[PDB]
Amino acid sequence: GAPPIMGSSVYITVELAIAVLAILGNVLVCWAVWLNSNLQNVTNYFVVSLAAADILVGVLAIPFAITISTGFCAACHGCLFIACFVLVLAQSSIFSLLAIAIDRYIAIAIPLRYNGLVTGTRAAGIIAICWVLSFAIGLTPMLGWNNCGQPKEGKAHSQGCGEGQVACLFEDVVPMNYMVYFNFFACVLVPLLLMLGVYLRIFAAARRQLADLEDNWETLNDNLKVIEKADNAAQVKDALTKMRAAALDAQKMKDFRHGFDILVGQIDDALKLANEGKVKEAQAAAEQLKTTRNAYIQKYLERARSTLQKEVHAAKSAAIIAGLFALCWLPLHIINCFTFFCPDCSHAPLWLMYLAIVLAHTNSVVNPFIYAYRIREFRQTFRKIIRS
Ligand SMILES: CC(C)CCC[C@@H](C)[C@H]1CC[C@H]2[C@@H]3CC=C4C[C@@H](O)CC[C@]4(C)[C@H]3CC[C@]12C
Ligand SMILES: CC(C)CCC[C@@H](C)[C@H]1CC[C@H]2[C@@H]3CC=C4C[C@@H](O)CC[C@]4(C)[C@H]3CC[C@]12C
Ligand SMILES: CC(C)CCC[C@@H](C)[C@H]1CC[C@H]2[C@@H]3CC=C4C[C@@H](O)CC[C@]4(C)[C@H]3CC[C@]12C
Ligand SMILES: CCCCCCCC/C=C\CCCCCCCC(=O)OC[C@H](O)CO
Ligand SMILES: Nc1nc(NCCc2ccc(O)cc2)nc2nc(-c3ccco3)nn12
Numbered sequence: 392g393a394p395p396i397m398g399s400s401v402y403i404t405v406e407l408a409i410a411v412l413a414i415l416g417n418v419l420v421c422w423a424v425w426l427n428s429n430l431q432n433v434t435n436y437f438v439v440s441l442a443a444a445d446i447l448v449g450v451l452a453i454p455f456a457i458t459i460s461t462g463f464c465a466a467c468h469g470c471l472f473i474a475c476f477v478l479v480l481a482q483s484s485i486f487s488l489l490a491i492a493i494d495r496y497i498a499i500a501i502p503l504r505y506n507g508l509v510t511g512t513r514a515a516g517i518i519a520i521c522w523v524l525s526f527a528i529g530l531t532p533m534l535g536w537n538n539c540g541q542p543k544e545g546k547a548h549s550q551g552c553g554e555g556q557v558a559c560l561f562e563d564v565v566p567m568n569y570m571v572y573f574n575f576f577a578c579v580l581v582p583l584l585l586m587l588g589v590y591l592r593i594f595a596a597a598r599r600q601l602a603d604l605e606d607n608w609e610t611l612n613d614n615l616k617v618i619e620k621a622d623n624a625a626q627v628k629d630a631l632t633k634m635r636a637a638a639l640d641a642q643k644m645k646d647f648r649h650g651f652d653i654l655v656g657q658i659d660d661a662l663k664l665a666n667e668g669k670v671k672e673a674q675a676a677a678e679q680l681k682t683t684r685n686a687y688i689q690k691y692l693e694r695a696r697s698t699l700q701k702e703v704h705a706a707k708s709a710a711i712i713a714g715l716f717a718l719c720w721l722p723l724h725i726i727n728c729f730t731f732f733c734p735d736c737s738h739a740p741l742w743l744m745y746l747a748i749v750l751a752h753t754n755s756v757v758n759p760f761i762y763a764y765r766i767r768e769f770r771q772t773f774r775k776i777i778r779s
């Protein structure tokens with residue numbers, strides 16, 4: 392039985408190193424958004440709420456974790472707060488992560504209404520509500536779902552605790568049914584699975600929209616060929632009718648409108664000549680469409696594909712963030728499930744408990760790195776900030 396201060400010393404030093412790094416990186420995120428108007432958008436207001444939660448892991452939840460690892464004598468309700476505050480911060484992260492995912496789904500599914508529907512003012516109201524809800528969920532044990540009514544009095548007396556105090560230890564005061572059913576299943580795993588569903592819808596929508604862009608391009612070009620080797624006016628007509636419909640369809644910014652105006656106009660010219668039974672004149676007219684395609688429609692296609700690919704890249708960055716939160720927190724939640732559902736199983740050993748706790752805390756360090764590696768406007772703003 393090694394002096395407890397030695398293992399304690401390692402755990403505490405590591406927690407402190409994590410806290411420094413969580414503060415530094417996430418302050419840098421907040422400073423970048425504050426300084427750069429190109430980063431000031433609704434998506435990034437949720438990014439900042441998430442960075443604030445991670446700053447608070449460093450300033451408060453890690454000092455609290457260090458404290459409760461000592462098992463110091465405390466009033467049971469003050470102990471609860473120490474124990475549970477980190478659950479407020481985690482819940483808030485889950486809400487910011489779910490908000491980010493929904494925001495990106497709206498942006499790809501209804502880009503036309505996104506700006507009128509998702510506003511900064513509404514985003515700030517939603518962030519305030521989510522913080523209130525996170526306090527309610529994470530401090531639910533302080534509302535009575537706790538083990539304070541059943542204190543471990545032999546353990547309190549061995550440590551010399553005073554009357555009404557307990558040894559302040561996480562699994563002595565926080566019920567494991569709360570941790571597994573309420574906190575993990577309902578409040579963590581359900582949201583994370585919802586996030587997964589949303590990201591699946593974002594990526595399927597992008598892939599549908601890119602395939603439609605290419606279809607339309609291919610349709611335009613096939614129908615041109617159809618026209619070229621048509622032999623009677625009626626065939627030219629049918630293929631122009633399909634082109635016209637697709638054109639007004641693809642229509643759904645001045646240099647872009649002028650291109651589709653030319654396009655539809657030239658189709659109409661050709662249709663009219665076809666309807667008068669002037670096949671050669673119609674085919675020649677239709678050939679002019681090639682100039683418009685080269686000088687306008689291709690540029691349209693290329694910019695639309697590029698916007699979509701940017702949205703896909705951005706949605707992957709956001710999903711990496713959500714996936715890393717799951718990876719860092721799931722080991723602890725899974726251990727709790729073993730403790731709870733398998734009372735015939737030996738408790739996970741202390742070294743693994745503390746490993747799982749610091750892994751969860753490390754999540755508060757990783758997001759600024761994902762932003763720097765994957766989002767140029769962040770990377771570049773971090774550079775300017777650091778260089779200055
Ligand atoms: C705004 C920020 C900086 C304020 C942080 C205040 C924190 C540190 C305060 C607020 C509530 C406090 C707890 C309230 C009650 C008790 C019970 C007592 O037997 C041991 C201390 C303990 C467990 C306190 C520890 C310190 C505590 C957690
Ligand atoms: C990649 C992430 C999401 C998955 C991590 C899975 C981890 C947490 C799993 C894999 C194997 C598991 C261990 C398997 C066996 C035991 C022995 C039992 O008496 C206590 C629990 C304990 C010690 C488990 C704790 C949780 C555990 C370490
Ligand atoms: C990973 C994502 C998809 C979902 C989360 C999976 C969780 C809920 C699963 C994965 C492994 C599971 C554990 C595997 C083994 C046992 C031992 C058994 O005696 C009690 C249930 C218990 C402790 C399971 C509880 C639930 C569990 C922890
Ligand atoms: C805005 C930034 C401000 C920074 C804020 C600092 C963070 C708080 C640090 C530690 C709190 C945890 C320490 C609680 C320790 C309690 C120790 C104690 O109470 O010992 C009594 C003994 O057990 C007999 O009752
Ligand atoms: N199970 C658990 N324990 C602890 N700390 C106590 C570790 C321990 C466990 C058993 C023991 O006899 C002595 C120490 N912190 C904890 N934090 C969490 C947590 C936060 C979010 C999900 O789980 N679970 N959790």
Ligand SMILES: CCCCCCCC/C=C\CCCCCCCC(=O)O
Pocket residue numbers: 450454455457458461462463464
């Ligand atoms: C930026 C400001 C952040 C301030 C962080 C302060 C650092 C405090 C570190 C941990 C405090 C742990 C106290 C240990 C509990 C007492 C042990 C006992 O009574 O037996």
Ligand code: NA
Pocket residue numbers: 441444445480481484754755
């Ligand atoms: Na977080």
